[PDB]
Design a protein around this ligand. Structure first.
Ligand SMILES: [Mg+2]
Ligand SMILES: [Mg+2]
Ligand SMILES: [Mg+2]
Ligand SMILES: [Mg+2]
Ligand SMILES: [Mg+2]
Ligand SMILES: [Mg+2]
Ligand SMILES: [Mg+2]
Ligand SMILES: [Mg+2]
Ligand SMILES: [Mg+2]
Ligand SMILES: [Mg+2]
Ligand SMILES: [Mg+2]
Lengths: 151, 261, 113
RNA sequence: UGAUUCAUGAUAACUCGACGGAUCGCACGGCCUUCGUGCCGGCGACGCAUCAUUCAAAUUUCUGCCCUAUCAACUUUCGAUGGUAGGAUAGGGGCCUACCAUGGUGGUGACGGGUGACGGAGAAUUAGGGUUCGAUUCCGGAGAGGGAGCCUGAGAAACGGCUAC
RNA sequence: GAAACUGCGAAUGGCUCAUUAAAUCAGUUAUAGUUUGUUUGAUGGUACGUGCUACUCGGAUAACCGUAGUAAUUCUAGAGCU
């Protein structure tokens, strides 16, 4: 409903407010990262194409890619994957978190949008140090491996 | 528990440290090292307790962080390093050397020595066996593993070990007729000469050892450690020549020192 | 009239100091102050600088008229800073102290960033 | 070695190989080959891999524990006792699986009940012999409201970690 | 030098005695039936080259900048760097 735009081509992002159903009918009922035609969103987005990807809602539960429902499911999430970014959480810890699904639907509050089409001696010293030190282990090897041989 | 134990409460420490039961709740926990942590003496004890070069746990820490202290030929920073039987403790700043050997009362002594005795230690071999590609090597009871020994050094024998070139410079074939110092039990420290060894198939073997002045005693083969070939030692015996004695005798000695004083 | 008696004296190069037990005999006196005792030791060991003298743990035996204590002499002031407890430096004026507030000390910091 | 088809060697292959340094410090200081941080070459910090050691555990042999028979039989279909082959484990083992046999314990007290029962080192009392206590600072074990299942990790069935009820 | 990524630790200690009656436990055994970060000591060639002596250097992620949602908390999304 509230939309947060960004572009990687320049590096600028901006939040806008829209509330018209027919401007979002082709916005509802789709999924993250699958391209959307820009013309439906209005007459001032032509030529611009958005890759719809990400978004949060009332209750603030982010969309997660790969879960196919306008629902709010309880997933067991590893610290390091999207929608779980615990800090100081004892690696190996998991949680069952609540995340909205990736189907763009009525129940979101903010949609995330991006624009696709605009309208040395150390190494030398240290290297040959090892090589001289590998050659000596066989230097040491032969130095005692034959002294015992005569016995 | 669910893992190792990192604390040593004082009452649980080896009795031969002579730590005092009210001097604190814990003791120095001996770190993993070349000696078996019940037959060792850590560095903390040697500095603060015996030598009194320090007054606290933190002061001995600083001394090692200046690196004045060297053990067995190499400089050791560890506070609770497990020094053991026949180690050498040397402080070049003071220019002093020590062997670690037992009282007749079974407690470690820092035996002051010259430089020429610092060059070497003695070790008894744990076992001799083949290894990678059939390359003969031996285990000592000091953790050390020496590859390419004399084919004569068998199990239980003792070796001289130069700390500079680090290989065998001599060896004693453990057998009857040599002088030995005992490193465990109630007889630990007591030196003497193997008079007999009786084995028992499937058990430990018993060594029979007699003080220079007649007294006869026995241990098991584990606590035996030859010093020299024949009667003569290859190391400097401590303040008492390994001869243990009755309680009456040291009572007599004080009053005998108390008749001259 | 007091007499100053140092026993169990041993000089270690490892911490670059000389250590001993001080016995002070002080008839008539309640107790000799460490500042006053500071001076007498500096004038018996020729230390050239009165600040490398550190004494503590005075016991003042039953009956009066005698006290024990412990004394540290360093030969370098630089040494007297590295190998010394930071509070014993304060006792000789070489430093000053601070306090804490236990609340907040880390608990809400751990939550912030 | 008390005792091993042991240690260890040779050979024939097999693996979708964990591995076998693209890392970091000060200190300079011998001498040119193009006189070119120039060829060197030091001491160290961290790291990977095998064996040994150490700090440890995990199982494990023998003997040993209070009161009770108004508790004389208990276990065994569906593991109870053994066998063989596997599976799993870090590894032995009915630990688990398939097939087979009919075993295992018991008046020397099995099985079952009570315990205001964690075990020991110990404590009170003590002519001796004893009687009673031992939650508690040392050692061993077990638990974190009750059960259970796990992740990470060398090590946890962890709770000042997680998941479910 | 702070933050932050990375590595290690947090499996020790502290507390208690509920369950538990050959069980835990004690003395005494065994592992040739096992794992073992760490310490200490030793050890380490071949990757492909048709082993006739080494064969080239990948993006992307914190701290940071900035847009935000949720009443919500070391809840959480998207873009720009390194
Ligand atoms: Mg320790
Ligand atoms: Mg079977
Ligand atoms: Mg089997
Ligand atoms: Mg109970
Ligand atoms: Mg109770
Ligand atoms: Mg409670
Ligand atoms: Mg537990
Ligand atoms: Mg739990
Ligand atoms: Mg708590
Ligand atoms: Mg504990
Ligand atoms: Mg090593």
């Amino acid at each position: 409903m509230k939309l947060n735009i960004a572009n990687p081509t320049t590096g600028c992002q901006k939040k806008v407010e829209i509330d018209d159903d027919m401007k979002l009918r082709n916005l509802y009922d789709k999924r993250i990262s699958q391209e959307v035609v820009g013309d439906l969103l209005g007459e001032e987005f032509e030529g611009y194409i958005f890759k719809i990807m990400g978004g949060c809602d009332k209750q603030g539960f982010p969309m997660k890619q790969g879960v196919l429902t306008p629902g709010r499911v309880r997933l067991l999430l590893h610290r390091g994957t999207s929608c779980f970014r615990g800090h100081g959480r004892r690696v190996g810890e998991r949680r069952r978190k609540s995340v909205r699904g990736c189907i763009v639907s009525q129940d979101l509050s903010v949609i995330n949008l991006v624009i696709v089409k605009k309208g040395t001696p150390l190494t030398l010293q240290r290297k040959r140090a090892r090589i001289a030190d590998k050659k000596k282990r066989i230097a040491k090897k032969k130095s005692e491996a034959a002294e015992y041989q005569k016995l | 528990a669910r893992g190792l134990k990192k604390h040593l409460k004082r009452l649980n420490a080896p009795s031969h440290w002579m730590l005092d039961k009210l001097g604190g709740a814990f003791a120095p926990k001996p770190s993993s090292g070349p000696h078996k942590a019940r037959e060792c003496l850590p560095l903390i004890l040697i500095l603060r307790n015996r030598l009194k070069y320090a007054l606290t746990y933190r002061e001995v820490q600083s001394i090692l962080m200046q690196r004045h202290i060297m053990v067995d030929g190499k400089v050791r920073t560890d506070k609770t390093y497990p020094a053991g039987f026949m180690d050498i403790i040397s402080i070049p700043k003071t220019g002093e050397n020590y062997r670690l050997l037992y009282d007749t009362k079974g407690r470690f002594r820092l035996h002051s020595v010259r430089d020429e005795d610092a060059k070497f230690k003695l070790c008894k071999v744990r076992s001799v066996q083949f290894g990678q590609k059939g390359i003969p090597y031996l285990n000592t009871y000091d953790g050390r593993t020496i590859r390419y020994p004399d084919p004569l050094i068998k199990a239980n024998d003792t070796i001289k070990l130069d700390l500079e070139t680090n290989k065998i410079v001599d060896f004693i074939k453990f057998d009857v007729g040599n002088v030995v110092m005992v490193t465990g039990g109630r007889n630990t420290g007591r030196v003497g000469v193997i008079k007999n060894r009786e084995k028992h198939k499937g058990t430990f073997e018993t060594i029979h050892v007699e003080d220079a002045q007649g007294h006869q005693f026995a241990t098991r083969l584990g606590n035996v450690f030859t010093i020299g070939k024949g009667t003569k030692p290859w190391v400097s015996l401590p303040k008492g020549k390994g001869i243990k004695l009755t309680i009456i005798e040291e009572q007599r000695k004080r009053d005998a020192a108390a008749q001259a004083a | 009239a007091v007499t100053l008696r140092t026993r169990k004296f041993m000089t270690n190069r490892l911490l670059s100091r000389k250590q001993f037990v001080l016995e002070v005999i002080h008839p008539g006196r309640a107790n000799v102050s460490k500042a006053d005792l500071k001076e007498r030791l500096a004038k018996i060991y020729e230390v050239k600088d009165s600040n490398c003298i550190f004494v503590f743990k005075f016991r003042t035996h039953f009956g009066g008229g005698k006290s024990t204590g412990f004394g540290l002499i360093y030969d370098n002031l630089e040494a007297a800073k590295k190998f010394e407890p930071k509070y014993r430096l304060i006792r000789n004026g070489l430093a000053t102290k601070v306090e804490k507030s236990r609340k907040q000390i880390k608990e809400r910091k751990n939550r912030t960033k």
